[PDB]
Design an enzyme around this catalytic site. Structure first.
Site, PDB file in Angstrom:
ATOM      1  N   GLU A 125       0.831  -1.320   0.005  1.00 20.46           N
ATOM      2  CA  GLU A 125       0.108   0.098  -0.164  1.00 20.46           C
ATOM      3  C   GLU A 125       0.934   1.330  -0.037  1.00 20.46           C
ATOM      4  O   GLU A 125       1.910   1.396   0.762  1.00 20.46           O
ATOM      5  CB  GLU A 125      -0.837  -0.113   1.266  1.00 20.46           C
ATOM      6  CG  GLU A 125      -1.785   1.190   1.133  1.00 20.46           C
ATOM      7  CD  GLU A 125      -2.959   1.266   2.184  1.00 20.46           C
ATOM      8  OE1 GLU A 125      -2.947   0.249   3.054  1.00 20.46           O
ATOM      9  OE2 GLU A 125      -3.857   2.097   2.177  1.00 20.46           O
ATOM     10  N   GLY A 266       3.301   2.416  10.956  1.00 19.98           N
ATOM     11  CA  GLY A 266       3.083   1.519  11.928  1.00 19.98           C
ATOM     12  C   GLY A 266       2.813   0.244  11.520  1.00 19.98           C
ATOM     13  O   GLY A 266       3.342  -0.708  12.405  1.00 19.98           O
ATOM     14  N   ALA A 267       2.250  -0.221  10.604  1.00 24.60           N
ATOM     15  CA  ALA A 267       1.677  -1.562  10.404  1.00 24.60           C
ATOM     16  C   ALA A 267       0.915  -1.551   9.108  1.00 24.60           C
ATOM     17  O   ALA A 267       0.640  -0.482   8.563  1.00 24.60           O
ATOM     18  CB  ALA A 267       0.963  -2.241  11.481  1.00 24.60           C
ATOM     19  N   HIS A 302      -6.334  -1.876  15.083  1.00 22.77           N
ATOM     20  CA  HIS A 302      -6.508  -1.047  13.954  1.00 22.77           C
ATOM     21  C   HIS A 302      -6.403  -2.142  12.609  1.00 22.77           C
ATOM     22  O   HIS A 302      -7.338  -2.113  11.953  1.00 22.77           O
ATOM     23  CB  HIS A 302      -5.439   0.025  13.891  1.00 22.77           C
ATOM     24  CG  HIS A 302      -5.595   0.843  12.517  1.00 22.77           C
ATOM     25  ND1 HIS A 302      -6.245   2.090  12.659  1.00 22.77           N
ATOM     26  CD2 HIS A 302      -5.244   0.551  11.365  1.00 22.77           C
ATOM     27  CE1 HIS A 302      -5.751   2.574  11.432  1.00 22.77           C
ATOM     28  NE2 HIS A 302      -5.236   1.685  10.628  1.00 22.77           N
ATOM     29  N   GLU A 303      -5.403  -2.840  12.680  1.00 20.18           N
ATOM     30  CA  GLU A 303      -5.120  -3.965  11.815  1.00 20.18           C
ATOM     31  C   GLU A 303      -5.954  -4.839  11.636  1.00 20.18           C
ATOM     32  O   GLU A 303      -6.650  -5.194  10.450  1.00 20.18           O
ATOM     33  CB  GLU A 303      -3.494  -4.426  11.605  1.00 20.18           C
ATOM     34  CG  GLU A 303      -2.576  -3.409  11.664  1.00 20.18           C
ATOM     35  CD  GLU A 303      -2.675  -2.240  10.315  1.00 20.18           C
ATOM     36  OE1 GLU A 303      -3.225  -2.509   9.416  1.00 20.18           O
ATOM     37  OE2 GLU A 303      -2.171  -1.103  10.726  1.00 20.18           O
ATOM     38  N   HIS A 306      -9.381  -3.662  10.111  1.00 24.07           N
ATOM     39  CA  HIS A 306      -9.336  -3.495   8.595  1.00 24.07           C
ATOM     40  C   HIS A 306      -9.735  -4.568   7.977  1.00 24.07           C
ATOM     41  O   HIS A 306     -10.269  -4.645   6.895  1.00 24.07           O
ATOM     42  CB  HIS A 306      -7.847  -3.048   8.365  1.00 24.07           C
ATOM     43  CG  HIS A 306      -7.283  -1.871   8.178  1.00 24.07           C
ATOM     44  ND1 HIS A 306      -8.299  -0.581   7.550  1.00 24.07           N
ATOM     45  CD2 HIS A 306      -6.403  -0.928   8.544  1.00 24.07           C
ATOM     46  CE1 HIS A 306      -7.744   0.276   7.410  1.00 24.07           C
ATOM     47  NE2 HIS A 306      -6.393   0.220   8.004  1.00 24.07           N
ATOM     48  N   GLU A 325      -9.736   4.188   6.247  1.00 19.72           N
ATOM     49  CA  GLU A 325      -8.830   4.766   7.733  1.00 19.72           C
ATOM     50  C   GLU A 325      -9.558   5.714   8.585  1.00 19.72           C
ATOM     51  O   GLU A 325      -9.313   5.389   9.897  1.00 19.72           O
ATOM     52  CB  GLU A 325      -7.909   5.606   7.059  1.00 19.72           C
ATOM     53  CG  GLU A 325      -6.699   4.740   6.077  1.00 19.72           C
ATOM     54  CD  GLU A 325      -6.370   3.598   6.796  1.00 19.72           C
ATOM     55  OE1 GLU A 325      -6.405   3.328   7.879  1.00 19.72           O
ATOM     56  OE2 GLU A 325      -5.735   2.637   6.055  1.00 19.72           O
TER      57      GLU A 325
END
Ligand SMILES: [NH3+][C@H]1CCc2cccc(-c3ccccc3)c2CC1(O)O
Ligand code: NA
Ligand code: NA
Ligand SMILES: [Zn+2]
EC number: 3.4.11.-
Length: 891
Positions: A125, A266-267, A302-303, A306, A325
């Protein structure tokens, strides 16, 4: 100019990619990528050339339907685009194949396929998959992936790609391979591959409703396997939260999380294979500071979130970035607030928004959360898109309430499952729930869409009237957004204002908390049966992302700070008292400077405000987390929103005066609290348990460390004794604080060496030590930076190392903004040096220049000169060039 993509220009592709079959063969000095794309002609095709993205690839061969194509005659390749002339493109389903050579071992930009220490890892990404193989590299090109990875088995025993591992096989010459099938249609930005000598912890999770067994793996290099447990616990918590709040279950038999040392962000939510900056996955209580735990919780959550908001529902185009996001940040905020059960989670997020994001939104870089154009989409992973986006996503919950919010969210996630979506699709789903809530099918959220398209921070101001005879109270509200370079005319937004009313005689609530819906430029809200004149508690929970002008007196603000129920309003009331003081003293110092006065007056800090701070601090039943917020002045990047032509030395003098005024009154209180908090703050319960974190205890340590800083700056008698004892604590948050606060004493370099020795054997702890030095309030900071460069940082290309050395220092108001410009010169040198191998990180290092046009005119000139010099550098990256052209009003 450069190539600019525009939101209005979106059109579907004339082609379809249905399946991707990859063979990635890793060797020491090259990686060979073979790829077969099962393609077709879409209903939008008009006989155009077939154009693939492909950046920096070395072509061995490309073919259509088994015949190799020939350069010049059937295709051209310019190192960015592969064009196959339409006369050679089939009219129906066809196979495109290619073999290219790439070099992860020299890929220091950390985009595409690269080497991080001894781990081969990808980051695709936004537009990185084109650095691995040819693709129509945009998120609406969704396909299914069959990926084989091969490598030397001794060097790379663990091979991972997205989805089910369907085969493992030995290969002559000490090699081996693994083949993966990902059954979920996906855009190429969600592809990932990892190869390395990885160690893991694992667990089995059983989904709540379908009872699906999921194998969970967390991976790191061998040295740091002991640091993986908290991440695994956070993943289990994340899975349960999405099940419990949203009814969402994981959708593969396996989920892998992988830590790598070199990562630009971050990831990354690659399907079934989330990849993390090690600093956002790995921790242990003896080798990490407290803040690591909430960071890992946030990033793992967060990940994971998603998986639905980004993966199962993805993006039509990159202008929709906030749809995944902003929404995923909002989901993670709900999660973290529920997990920590502190005020810190929300107040910390608001503090970041109102500093960094408000600054961005008033800068030349200001954009709406759905931008209108870009050159490098990597420059639009911004606090605006993420954090203002999250506040826009949160306002739907505030407006609808939990029941109807969940209903609208499920409409969105169900309708768009397995497909791309746009911001309008989300607003449509929320609008359906809105029609239900209002019991009115004529109700709509058309105005709400302005939160996506209109840039700038609204200003909401208030006037009040109370009629004691009628027992009737009115709140008159106005909203205004300043015109900017995106809109000459600003329109009123749908602003939800969560409110209470406090009786100033007893501190009690006078109404049920209520959300006012301001949709016009102004409106008057009237309340009956208000028995006495209230103090309004406005924007509870920070209910809209706005500048709040409460038009309250400091006496009223003190009463809210003491007695209101809402943590945000209490904290904001305190912030507003500080801001009034800061602006007044700043102006007094500024006038004295400009007029070259030999004597002048300063307005003292309000004595009742100081009394109120003492009152709150001494309350044994009050929350330590909240207390740390009230003893610190607002951040400099918040303050700057309220001053034009800001002289940073005048601001430093202002803050020092205010802090000393308060400390002269409260230092004995601060010291008594620092000592009395020790037993509970530093208790060793759970010190060996990486599955449990006491966030309240952590806030007690934060408070102690904040108070110790204040006492150290004040040179409180004999405080060095406390500093030295603090350096002996088992908790890294404490012993690293001992270094910071020792900057005001002759023991600084002794503690520098002590803490260096405690940090140097753990990569992430050493990075925390670098940050602690970088932010140290030292008059000799520039010589200290040279020492870090020569002795620790050296030639590292690790983004964590570079960012740790330089970014904290850029927030040193007196030193970084030294009127000579030496700080601007130093950071610009680092930016230009870094841009030659990592454009993304170089652009991250530009952060301090974002406020250039807010400073005094001498500093504006110094910063502009450095930015223009950076722009003149030969071979400047598109990332950095776009950023600086936009920031200097050239683009
Ligand atoms: N899709 C990716 C894109 C990269 C990126 C960029 C900037 C910030 C962040 C990020 C935000 C909050 C917490 C952790 C990381 C991310 C991670 C991401 O997952 O959004
Ligand atoms: Na190194
Ligand atoms: Na290193
Ligand atoms: Zn994200």
């Amino acid at each position: 100019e450069p190539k600019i993509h525009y939101r209005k220009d979106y059109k579907p592709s004339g082609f379809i990619i249905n399946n991707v079959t990859l063979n990635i063969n890793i060797h020491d000095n090259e990686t060979i990528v073979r790829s077969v794309l099962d393609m077709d002609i879409s209903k939008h095709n008009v006989g155009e050339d077939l154009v693939f993205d492909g950046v920096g690839l070395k072509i061995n061969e490309i073919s259509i339907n088994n015949k190799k194509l020939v350069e010049g005659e059937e295709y051209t390749y310019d190192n960015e685009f592969l064009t196959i002339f339409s006369k050679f493109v089939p009219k129906s389903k066809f196979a495109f194949s290619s073999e290219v050579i790439i070099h992860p071992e020299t890929n220091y930009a950390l985009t595409g396929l690269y080497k991080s220490k001894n781990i081969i890892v990808s980051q695709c990404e936004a537009t990185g998959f084109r650095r691995i193989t040819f693709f129509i590299d945009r998120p609406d090109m969704m396909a299914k992936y069959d990926v084989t990875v091969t490598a030397d088995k001794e060097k790379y025993p663990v091979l991972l790609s997205n989805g089910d591992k369907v085969n493992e096989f030995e290969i002559p010459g000490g090699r081996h391979g693994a083949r993966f099938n990902d059954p979920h249609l996906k855009p190429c930005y969600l592809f990932a591959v990892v190869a390395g000598d990885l160690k893991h912890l694992s667990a089995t999770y059983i989904t709540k409703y379908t009872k699906k067994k999921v194998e969970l793996y967390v991976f790191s290099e061998e040295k740091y396997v002991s640091k993986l447990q908290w991440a695994l616990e956070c993943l289990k918590k994340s899975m349960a939260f999405d099940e419990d709040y949203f009814g969402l279950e994981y959708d593969l038999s396996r989920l892998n999380l992988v830590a790598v040392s070199d990562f630009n962000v971050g990831a990354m939510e690659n399907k079934g294979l989330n990849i993390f900056n090690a600093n956002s996955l790995l921790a242990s209580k003896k080798n990490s500071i407290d803040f690591s735990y909430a960071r890992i919780l946030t990033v793992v959550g967060h990940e994971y979130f998603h998986n639905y908001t980004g993966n199962r529902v993805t993006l039509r185009d990159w202008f929709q970035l906030t749809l995944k996001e902003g929404l995923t940040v909002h989901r993670e905020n709900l999660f973290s607030e529920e997990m920590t059960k502190t005020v810190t989670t929300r107040l910390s997020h608001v503090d970041l928004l109102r500093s960094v994001q408000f600054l961005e939104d008033s800068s030349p870089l200001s954009h709406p959360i759905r931008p209108e154009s870009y050159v490098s989409m990597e420059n639009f992973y911004t606090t605006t898109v993420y954090d203002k986006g999250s506040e826009v996503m949160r306002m739907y919950l505030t407006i609808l309430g939990e029941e109807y919010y969940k209903k609208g969210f499920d409409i969105y996630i169900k309708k768009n499952d397995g497909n791309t979506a746009t911001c309008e699709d989300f607003n449509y789903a929320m609008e359906q729930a809105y029609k239900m809530k209002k019991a009115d099918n004529s109700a709509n959220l058309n105005q709400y869409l302005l939160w996506f398209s209109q840039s700038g921070t609204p200003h909401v101001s208030f006037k009040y009237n109370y009629d004691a005879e009628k027992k009737q109270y009115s709140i008159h509200v106005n909203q205004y957004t300043k015109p900017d370079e995106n809109q000459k005319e600003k329109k009123p937004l749908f602003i939800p204002i969560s409110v209470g009313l406090i009786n100033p005689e007893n501190g009690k609530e006078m109404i049920s908390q209520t959300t006012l819906e301001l949709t016009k430029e102004s409106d008057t809200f009237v309340f009956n049966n208000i028995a006495v004149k209230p103090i309004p508690s406005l924007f509870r929970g920070f209910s809209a992302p706005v500048y709040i002008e409460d038009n309250l007196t400091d006496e009223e603000r003190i009463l809210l700070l003491k007695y209101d129920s809402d943590a945000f309003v209490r904290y904001n009331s305190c912030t507003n008292i500080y801001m009034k003081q800061i602006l007044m003293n700043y102006n007094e110092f500024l006038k004295a400077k400009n007029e070259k006065l030999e004597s002048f007056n300063l307005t003292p800090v309000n004595a009742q405000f100081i009394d109120a701070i003492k009152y709150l601090l001494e309350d044994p039943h009050a929350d330590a987390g909240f207390k740390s917020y009230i003893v610190s002045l607002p951040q400099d990047r918040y303050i700057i929103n309220f001053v034009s032509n800001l002289d940073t030395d005048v601001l430093a003098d202002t803050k020092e005066y205010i802090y000393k005024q308060i400390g002269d009154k409260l230092n004995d209180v601060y010291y008594k609290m620092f000592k009395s908090l020790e037993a509970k703050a530093d208790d060793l319960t759970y010190f060996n348990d990486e599955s449990h974190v006491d966030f309240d205890q952590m806030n007690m340590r934060t408070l102690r460390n904040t108070l110790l800083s204040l006492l150290s700056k004040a040179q409180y008698p004999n405080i060095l004794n406390e500093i030295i004892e603090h350096s002996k604590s088992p908790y890294p948050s404490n012993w690293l604080t001992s270094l910071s606060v020792s900057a005001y004493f002759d023991k600084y370099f002794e503690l520098y060496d002590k803490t260096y020795k405690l940090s140097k054997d753990d990569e992430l702890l050493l990075q925390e030590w670098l940050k602690t030095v970088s932010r140290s309030d030292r008059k000799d900071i520039y010589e200290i930076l040279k020492k870090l460069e020569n002795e620790v940082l050296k030639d590292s290309k690790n983004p964590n190392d570079i960012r740790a050395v330089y970014l904290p220092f850029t927030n040193n108001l007196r030193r970084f903004h030294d009127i000579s410009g030496k700080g601007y010169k130093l950071i610009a040198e680092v930016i230009t040096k870094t841009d030659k191998f990592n454009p993304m990180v170089a652009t991250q290092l530009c952060e301090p220049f974002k406020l250039w046009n807010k400073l005094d005119t001498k500093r504006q000139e110094l910063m502009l000169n450095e930015m223009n010099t950076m722009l003149q550098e030969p071979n400047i990256s598109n990332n950095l060039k776009e950023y600086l052209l936009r920031l200097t009003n050239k683009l």
